[PDB]
Design a protein around this motif. Structure first.
Motif, PDB file in Angstrom:
ATOM      1  N   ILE A 119       4.524  -0.952  12.310  1.00  0.00           N
ATOM      2  CA  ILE A 119       3.255  -1.417  11.752  1.00  0.00           C
ATOM      3  C   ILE A 119       2.287  -1.788  12.872  1.00  0.00           C
ATOM      4  N   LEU A 120       2.814  -2.497  13.855  1.00  0.00           N
ATOM      5  CA  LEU A 120       2.041  -2.872  15.034  1.00  0.00           C
ATOM      6  C   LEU A 120       1.321  -1.656  15.633  1.00  0.00           C
ATOM      7  N   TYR A 121       2.068  -0.587  15.936  1.00  0.00           N
ATOM      8  CA  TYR A 121       1.425   0.561  16.595  1.00  0.00           C
ATOM      9  C   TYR A 121       0.440   1.316  15.692  1.00  0.00           C
ATOM     10  N   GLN A 160      -1.515  -0.218  13.593  1.00  0.00           N
ATOM     11  CA  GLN A 160      -2.762  -0.996  13.640  1.00  0.00           C
ATOM     12  C   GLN A 160      -3.362  -0.878  15.053  1.00  0.00           C
ATOM     13  N   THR A 161      -2.508  -0.722  16.062  1.00  0.00           N
ATOM     14  CA  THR A 161      -3.026  -0.424  17.427  1.00  0.00           C
ATOM     15  C   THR A 161      -3.856   0.871  17.515  1.00  0.00           C
ATOM     16  N   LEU A 162      -3.345   1.955  16.935  1.00  0.00           N
ATOM     17  CA  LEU A 162      -4.034   3.228  17.037  1.00  0.00           C
ATOM     18  C   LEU A 162      -5.325   3.075  16.268  1.00  0.00           C
ATOM     19  N   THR A 163      -5.256   2.393  15.132  1.00  0.00           N
ATOM     20  CA  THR A 163      -6.461   2.102  14.337  1.00  0.00           C
ATOM     21  C   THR A 163      -7.544   1.341  15.124  1.00  0.00           C
ATOM     22  N   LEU A 164      -7.140   0.336  15.893  1.00  0.00           N
ATOM     23  CA  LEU A 164      -8.100  -0.478  16.640  1.00  0.00           C
ATOM     24  C   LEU A 164      -8.713   0.270  17.804  1.00  0.00           C
ATOM     25  N   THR A 165      -7.973   1.224  18.347  1.00  0.00           N
ATOM     26  CA  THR A 165      -8.446   1.910  19.536  1.00  0.00           C
ATOM     27  C   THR A 165      -9.118   3.239  19.181  1.00  0.00           C
ATOM     28  N   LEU A 219      -7.666   5.895  17.392  1.00  0.00           N
ATOM     29  CA  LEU A 219      -6.751   7.035  17.379  1.00  0.00           C
ATOM     30  C   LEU A 219      -6.049   7.141  16.023  1.00  0.00           C
ATOM     31  N   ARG A 240      -2.582   9.286  14.309  1.00  0.00           N
ATOM     32  CA  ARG A 240      -1.522  10.243  14.054  1.00  0.00           C
ATOM     33  C   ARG A 240      -0.906   9.827  12.722  1.00  0.00           C
ATOM     34  N   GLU A 265       5.087  10.301  11.972  1.00  0.00           N
ATOM     35  CA  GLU A 265       5.076  10.650  13.385  1.00  0.00           C
ATOM     36  C   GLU A 265       5.090   9.421  14.305  1.00  0.00           C
ATOM     37  N   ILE A 266       4.356   8.372  13.938  1.00  0.00           N
ATOM     38  CA  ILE A 266       4.379   7.121  14.709  1.00  0.00           C
ATOM     39  C   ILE A 266       5.744   6.542  14.503  1.00  0.00           C
ATOM     40  N   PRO A 270      -4.615  -2.742   7.856  1.00  0.00           N
ATOM     41  CA  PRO A 270      -5.579  -3.237   6.902  1.00  0.00           C
ATOM     42  C   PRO A 270      -7.047  -2.958   7.246  1.00  0.00           C
ATOM     43  N   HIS A 271      -7.368  -1.859   7.947  1.00  0.00           N
ATOM     44  CA  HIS A 271      -8.795  -1.561   8.270  1.00  0.00           C
ATOM     45  C   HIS A 271      -9.636  -1.571   7.002  1.00  0.00           C
TER      46      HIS A 271
END
Lengths: 228, 225
Positions: free
Chosen positions: A43-45, A47-52, A54, A56, A60-61, A150-151
């Motif tokens: 879940i962390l990653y 939301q990370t890709l979302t914040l930056t 990106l 996938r 796949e994540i 949660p974007h």
């Protein structure tokens, strides 16, 4: 026309049982408990890709994170393991308490929708396999937003798609982060406890509007609220 | 010449020092590895939804949440100890030498953290390594956690630097991803239980070390590549 309201359900963990991935963690890691580490990492990653900025697809994540966590424990992982993770992820079974509560909520006049981080599959979807897909009028995913929950845009575009106003929507999850995301957009939030899923409580963060120790109790509260 | 921006928790300061608290409360210190991703996940959730509380308070509320998930009992005392321990993590042995090396090599050294500023002494001050740095930045004033793009941009702005002059150093790959997305370089240092995430279309770290000494070798190398 919303009727009693629109109930927008999270899928993984909420409807579909994540512990069904345990055997794979037991084998590969010698400990099924590693499931509770791999999942927040996933879940962390997302939301990370979302914040930056990106994107996938979730599965796949999920595979990259399972690899990552494996390395962290010094556990060997084959391309076979990754394929099984995909298999198990897309085949999680529904909790027994789901179908009766969906039946009760439908009969009480609620509209029922799913919203997931998981990318669209070809049919059959995990909920189709689980035999519960047909309770819902719509099955939406973050794939069209290219951003994970949660974007805000995931919830806003869902409300658009349903031609619904925020006050008519209720997000249901066992993940407080998903209810937080929806509530911040003006929706109501409904929390359903699942094993190893309890609500987070923090100042300035709105609590769920409804909470149940299981889906039946939550449906008691949602139905009770129609006439309360 | 180059500004190295160091992540602090996990990267400079040793997270496993929290283990005895996880041992006591949960009968298993490995629960540290469940709690910590939940903490980062929730910090990022708040940031995505326009909410903010200081990291240490998210830490406490997530600690309670995880306790409940295990059905483990938790008293106000256990929470107080989490704060104390979070604000008292020791520096890894390899840090002071590596920093001595990087400074002597001509690098400017800066820290950037999710943790809110405290009254002195800071975690870095107590560990005895604060004085290697020219500046200690936090996300606090901006009220957005890493890796939100503004944390890195506001850092560059604060330092009067442009992205090409900056290198984010972390054992947290999500933090190096955050910085590289804003055109910074990224430097990853393996720490126990941290290995890089490798995923299609996500930039990899520019530099990788299995510890802070080896990372510093690669950074010193790229000075006249």
């Amino acid at each position: 026309p919303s009727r009693s309201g629109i109930l927008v359900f999270d899928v993984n963990e909420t409807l579909l049982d994540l512990t069904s991935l345990s055997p794979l963690f037991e084998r590969v890691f010698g400990d099924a408990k590693v499931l509770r580490e791999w999942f927040p990492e996933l879940i962390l990653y997302s939301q990370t890709l979302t914040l930056t900025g990106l994107y996938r697809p979730f599965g796949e994540i999920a595979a990259a994170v399972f690899e990552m966590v494996a390395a962290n424990h010094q556990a060997k992982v084959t391309p076979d393991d990754i394929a099984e993770l995909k298999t198990r992820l897309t085949s999680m079974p529904a909790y027994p308490d789901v179908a009766p509560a969906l039946t009760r909520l439908q009969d009480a006049g609620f509209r029922l929708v799913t919203l997931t981080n998981s990318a669209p599959s070809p049919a059959p979807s995990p909920l189709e396999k689980a035999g519960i897909a047909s309770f819902f009028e719509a099955h939406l995913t973050v794939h069209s937003s290219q951003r994970f929950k949660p974007h805000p845009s995931v919830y806003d575009s869902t409300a658009e798609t349903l031609g619904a106003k925020p006050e008519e929507l209720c997000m249901i999850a066992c993940a407080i982060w998903d209810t937080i995301g929806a509530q911040a957009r003006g929706w109501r939030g409904g929390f359903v406890a699942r094993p190893h899923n309890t609500p987070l409580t923090l100042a300035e963060v709105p609590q769920p509007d409804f909470i149940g120790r299981d889906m039946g109790e939550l449906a008691d509260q949602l139905i009770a609220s129609l006439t309360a």
